[PDB]
């Protein structure tokens, strides 16, 4: 899975 | 499944 | 597909 | 395939 | 299938 | 065929 | 065959 | 399978 955060 | 939040 | 925005 | 983006 | 988005 | 546009 | 274009 | 984005 991923995980992306800004 | 996803979470998206902004 | 599919497609999710937030 | 896939695209993820934030 | 597909997907497209603009 | 198919044709697909967006 | 087959195009795909963005 | 392909992925395009721009």
Do not use: K, T
């Not at 899975?1 to 800004?6: H, W």
Request: net charge neutral; aromatic share 16%.
């Amino acid at each position: 899975g991923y995980v992306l955060g800004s």
